[model samples]
Target chain A: MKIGIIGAGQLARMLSLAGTPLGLEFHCLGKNGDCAEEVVKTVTDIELTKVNDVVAWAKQFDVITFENENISHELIKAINHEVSVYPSAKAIAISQDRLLEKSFMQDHGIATAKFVNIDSLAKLQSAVDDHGLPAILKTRRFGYDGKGQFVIRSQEDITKAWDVLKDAPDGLIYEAFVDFDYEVSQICTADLKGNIAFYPLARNTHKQGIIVESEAPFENVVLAEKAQQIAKILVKEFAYVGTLAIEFFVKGDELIVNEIAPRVHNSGHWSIDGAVTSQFENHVRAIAGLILGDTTSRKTVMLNCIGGMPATKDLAALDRVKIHSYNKEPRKGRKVGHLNLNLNDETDEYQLLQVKKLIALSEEI
Target chain B: MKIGIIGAGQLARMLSLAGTPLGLEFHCLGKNGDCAEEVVKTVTDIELTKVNDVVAWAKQFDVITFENENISHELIKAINHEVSVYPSAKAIAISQDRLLEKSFMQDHGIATAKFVNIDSLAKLQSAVDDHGLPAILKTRRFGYDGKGQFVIRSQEDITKAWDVLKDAPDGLIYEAFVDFDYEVSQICTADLKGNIAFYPLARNTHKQGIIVESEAPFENVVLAEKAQQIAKILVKEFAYVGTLAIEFFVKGDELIVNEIAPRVHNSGHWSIDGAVTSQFENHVRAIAGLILGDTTSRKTVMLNCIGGMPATKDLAALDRVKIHSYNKEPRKGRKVGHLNLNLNDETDEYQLLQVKKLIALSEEIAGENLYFQ
Candidate 1:
């Protein structure tokens, strides 16, 4: 089957790598010099910003998918080719806007921090007044990696937060700041036959708003069951057909919905080496109308190589560690690559020390 | 690093798949429509048969390797590009000609079947008389998959066998047929740093001289040590820089060398899913001057999809099974693809039954019936 991916980034590159082994072909529609173009055939000649050009190019594919949630749902709907697009237009529309996502969660009886839409500076102040101090003012759209959001720690910071986010194109939303105990993510895949599989919950650690480390099979039966239940409700509500990830803020037994990503997630990258089937392969399998492989988890730790990469030769020397380079040049604070450290049963201090050493080395470059 | 491959077959396709993840680039030099061309970049513009054209194309690569051993060793030697060509020309020369391989084994004190070169009809009969009856008359070169060989069961069959093989380009050799026991193969890899690793032995089953099925971690400690020793001697003697496999005939505790494949052998295909590091990746690693990954073995069974493929949906529905399709057109007696079945700690009857059912399905178009254990 021929699959057309919307964005030719690292996710597309990994999806193509994982899908090619199953006799599936791929064509990527993105700008020139996309990292995915190195591995698969890509269409970079046409105008990616033009709706008609993208629609025309997407006509030849058997199935279509987007690598990120930042794409236009209107452009996705404009493709009149009658091809099946996974995560559907509605799923993308809901995920692309924080207001819609928070409202959808509330409507479905899912637990989330209290939130209110803010269209003006006065409205932001009023919502902060009602929600009390220490709320967050966030843009309703195009927010990622802790961008387009500011915290209102005290009454004096409301105007300062407004000056930073008042001009958000899609307005803004005021949400109560959640002091989460720790963060977690669950990657879920649903096939066409209504069969759903959930990867074990991953305990994530973030540094400066970017995910840096994650450990899978977090061993919390109550939290995993709660996360899986939330995912089941969301997947059924959207009738979703591929992999989608849910990031949650865990405090005791409660899993407050942080956000939804309508594609394979960064936190689940460890599955490439630690799970029976990777999220990339499962995403491709679901979209291509194939049976999903096993989702059994192995003890693994994933560390993102942010901004710059340490020497690969040094990383390859680690026992059972799989190195993944995105083939992109590194800039400050950019995600250049990642490393998946596969650990044996009974975690040892050596690997933990290695993780620390790697982080220290990562700071050097 | 960029690697240039000699032949664009399934082996090259797999090597590319395994190497691309390591940030390695590949370009294959073969004819148009080669299976490997579908996966990696290829140079189909030059005449692959011409020595100059092949050597000129090979000079641009950082390292070179051959997917199959059929290439001209002289052409390989002529490429004085200073770029390393793994399994050097000398290794290829010995493996390409059966007589040289057998004589080399004998010279090195390696155990193999007794054999003698036959030049004329009288020489063939005399050699047969000196050795015994029921011998195989095989052409010295370009023999594979039970081809270019004739078996003589009695005195009346001597002239018949000679008539079938007398016009062979490289003449022939007469050898006593091995009828003692089953076969096994050990895949070995040696790095440029003098680091060598051996995969556990895999007990293999052959049909019509073509490998059909194999089960890894064969669990014979004594035989594994014996076979690994043989490989160590061969790798050390050749100063081999990549993966090479040794097929052995196992009779009780005796391990007799059958032949040496200068590259990854069919029996090692199971390593792709069943072992910590596959042979293809190790071959690329060794040639690229990198440390060889771990060669730990796992319990797995591999069944080659010969001639035709079973419905992929049926195969994919099986738990923990990895399907590998070569994307080749099916023809009688041709290897189109394979299936790697991963088993748990204890073997179960269900998987064994699945192996049987797959074998039965394969026999329909493979043109040979195989017995499953």
Candidate 2:
């Protein structure tokens, strides 16, 4: 069996890593820069430079999937007739735009932050009056990891933001700032048969609005079940297939949907080392129409490697901490690798101290 | 850092498989018959038809190593001058010939077996005359798995075997069979710096002389220490670098050294999924002049996937039973892949029983498993 990916980043690399041993081959559409790309027998032309070259290459795979949400839904629809694309183009279209995504959530009776489309200056002024201060004006598309967003603290704030952000979106999106205690991510998957599986809630922390860390099996079990129900409603509404991650904000008793990720999300990367069945492998299994593996935590904390990889010896010396270096050249703020530190109990002093020590060692580099 | 391998079978495949993620590159000699070739960046023309072409290709790597012992010491020596080769040419030269290996072992006070070299039919008769009947005859070079050996059960057994095996061995080797209960293998690694590490003993089982199954963290600590000492003595003798395996026969408290392998051995395949650091990974670390990973088991029983793979669902469904299918076309007696069945406790009821159940599953197609079908 074969699965073709639309993007060739670490996620694509991981998909191939997870899928290849199951005897499934992967043909990637982007740069062949992942370790997994080097090991599989079947592959895509690493040198193909056109979008249609990827579409043309799509004939090799039995099914198609995406690694990044940035892939245009029109590009997705172009080949939708050619092969079975998982998390279908309709699903991708919904996820690409913040407006479409939030509306889709609300349409399914899932709660989201108060928001208004920035189509008209009349409604834009009304949205500020209606939603109040400290709102974020965001692009409807192509924004991620806290990029493509501006803060609007007052009436003058909109005009001040208008000149710099006007070029981004013809019609923008404004979200009332969510005053929540903590954040969480739900990684859910659905097969073509409509059988859906939800990984336990991943309690998340963001540094500069970019996810820096995630802890699975969040203490709030009741909220996870409720979030899972909302996820089920969305996937079934979108007729979704393959893994999807939706970020949520928790405020007291309520869990509010923030945005949807149509593909594997970084918050769930811990599943690779810490879960019985990884989110990547499960995504491949769902698209391949195979039975999903176990998705229970076998870990708690997962740290994102921003800028560069940590010291290999320092991290390797510590047991049960899996070091995954993407072998990418280091750049400030680039996600070059990650560390999954799994422990039976997070409170265990020895392992917790090691986690801190490992983190300190990485930070030193 | 980069490492070059002399052969490109599954072992070289595995060596590359283990080394790639460690930020090391591998340039393997011979064919890229396995998946590891695709992942490692340093590679030569797979069609390099000459030995010099391989030697020329060796310039790409920081150091060189071997995956199989079949490569002549001369071929290794040919490239030895150009680049650094671990488990040096002299060590490989000693391992390739059984006579040289045994003498080297015995010279170091390592007990092998009461033996004689078969220089002639008279000497062959003399081996049996002196060593007694039920002796085994073998080729001094290029023998592995269960290949290239015959039992001299009686005086007539020699004449009976001579015609069929007559033209096979040039310097034929003969050995007196040691009465033994089970065979065990110890995978040991040494660096040029005189540092060494030993993986716990893997109690091995062979069918037709090919290893079929292995149970690791073998329970005899006293014998394990003794075997480790023997391996220590052997490697230091030749200043051996890289990994080596010594197969030993255990009869009561006493263990006799059967043979030595200069490269990673089949018995240590369990370490891939079962141990914290696989033998392939440790060998890479040792050869790369890096600190070794932990050699403790997270699994107990590892079954060799001879001929073909079994039902994937049956095995994958089991907790911690890692299935490594070589993606090789299955052939009779060929090791297509393997299953590493791990349990937190070896005596655990569910996992122990699955090991036996998985064996029965493999045997179902034992006869039907064919080459490249």
Candidate 3:
């Protein structure tokens, strides 16, 4: 079966690799000059920004899904119902708008931080007066990875925040800053029949808003179950087929939904070795209507090697860690590649811990 | 260092696959026929039967070894001592003769069935008279996988057995047969430094003398340990710098060495998924003096898919079993391919049993009936 993925990037590249062994073909709809074109099989370089080209490209594929949430809703609507689009354009529209997403979550009885929509400087001033200092100002659309947002510490910081988001026509939302212990991400897969299976929650560590490392099934089983329940409700409601990731901020036993990504997220990369069936493979399986392969854990860990000298030494030292280098021309703040470590019961956990520490040490070296 | 292997069959093909990942090149000394050319990255091929051509081919390689034990020892020794040949001509000579092998094992305090060498029909008749009935008649050289051997029940069958092996110029050995519970093969890797590590022993079952099923680390740990000990001694004594398989027949707690294979044996084929390091990869590693990879078990069962009709359903069922078909043209009584099933657990005993049963059922549909008395 053929699958068409929009926004070809590392996600699309990995999906292709997973699909190849299963005798499935994948076509990627990439932006002109996208790096995914080199790795994925059968790539079409159509400008997604140009609605007509994206709509025309969609017509050719058997089933289509986007790797990112940037695609316009109007472009999705242009395609006839002969082809199925996952998560629906309505879900994408809601996720794209921060104000709309917060309202939808609150209406659905989902736990979230307190927030208010601000259309102008007067409304921003009123929100500041009510919420006090340390409030967060975020644009309603086209913002991700900690971009298009700023923290208002004081009266002076409020004006700076306004200046940062003044160009955003949809305005912004002022949310009370949440105090949480650690950040985690839940990767969930839902079939066309609305049957959802949630992978273990991954403990996420981010540096300057970019994910640096993700440990699967973050220590707390109770929190993980709650997160899975939250994911199942959200994904089933949208009739999502393929993978969806939701970020959460955990405090004690409470988990507050931070944000949602309607595609396979970086935090789930460990599934490649940790689970019998990887997230990428299962996503393809869900789309193709094939029986899902096994999803049992086989001891998996994923460490992102970002924006530094490639951790080549750490890769050689580890026994079962498969290194994936992106071949990204070296530049600051770019995700070059990642290392996946798989361990079994016979694996020395102490040595694996030492290797993890050594990897951290070598990154500095 | 370059290694030249004589006989480019499946063993050589597997060695090439193992070497490709580690950047070691191999040259084969054989005719450029269907079997020799099948191995990927084969450097050159020459007529193995010709001594001058064999010496010329040996000059191009740093080390030379035979994939099979059937090579002429005289031709192997023609190459100068500067060129390394593993297990040596002396070792191969001793192993080539069943009588010599039995004597050597006896001299080394290794257990073997009682035997008598028969040079002629008169000698065979006298040995049979001495050893009595229920004996196996085996040729002294070039016999493997149940070939060139016959079981004689009484005096009435003695003439037919002698007639069968009369053409074998090297004569034969008639030995009293030992009834054993099961067969086990221990695969070991001995380096130039004389350090040997034995992989788990595979408990094997054969049909018509062809290996049909093999499960690693036989149910009895002590029996498995004894098999490994035997493998270590055999490989180290010869200063073997590659993989070797020592087959044994375990009767209760006691173990008897049956035979030795200088190359990777079919019984150890489960290492492709069962162990951290495969027999093929470890063989290359030992030969090249590289640090051996891990040989820990991760749940493995290998079943030989004997000759049968190839159908779409059989191919499709392979998606679940993870079949590794040997890409060979199928024929009756030929090993078409084998499936190596791996469970992602170290101690999942139930899963291991389930995989064995699944392989048996799959083979039944594939048309290789495993039911034998």
Indicate which candidate wins on lDDT: 1
True contacts kept of each: 0.22, 0.15, 0.00
Per-model TM-score on C-alpha atoms: 0.94, 0.88, 0.64
Per-residue lDDT value at A309 in model 1: 79
DockQ of 3: 0.06
Q: Kindly give the stretch of ten consecutive residues in candidate 2 chain A with the minimal lDDT sum.
A: A40-49
State residue A279's C-alpha deviation in candidate 1, in Å. Answer: 1.3
Minimum summed lDDT over a 10-residue window in model 3 chain A is located at A309-318
Better of 1 and 2 by DockQ: 1
Q: How does residue B245 of candidate 3 score in lDDT? A: 82
Instruction: Give interface RMSD, every candidate, in order.
Output: 2.2, 3.2, 7.9
Q: Write the per-residue lDDT of candidate 1 for residues B224-321, one digit (tens) a residue.
A: 99998888888888888899999998889998888898998899999988776799988988898877877777888888877877766666565456
lDDT of 3 at B293: 54
Best by TM-score: 1
Cα lDDT tens digits for candidate 2, B1-373: 6688876667877786666555566776666555445445544544434668777788777898988776767777877789878877888888888888888878877777676677667778877877787777777887776566777776887865455455665576778777787889889877667777788999998766677788888978899999989888877787887888999988887888888888888899888766656888778877877666656565467778877677665655554555566666767767777766555654344755875677666652323111110
Model 1, span A224-307: residue lDDT tens: 999999999989898899999999999998899999999999999999878877899899889988888778788888888887
- For model 3 chain B, the run of ten residues with the poorest summed lDDT: B364-373
Candidate 2 chain B weakest ten by summed lDDT? B364-373
Top-down TM-score ranking: 1, 2, 3
lDDT of 2 by residue, A1-365 (tens): 66788766678877866765565666776555554455444445543345576667886678988887767777777767788888888888888888988888777788998889886666777888898888988888888778888899888888876655677743588899889999999998887778877788988988886888898878677898888888888777888888989999999879999988888989999887667578888898888877666565654678777776656666555544555767667776778777776666543336557656666555422
Q: In candidate 1 chain B, where is summed lDDT lowest over 10 consecutive residues? A: B364-373
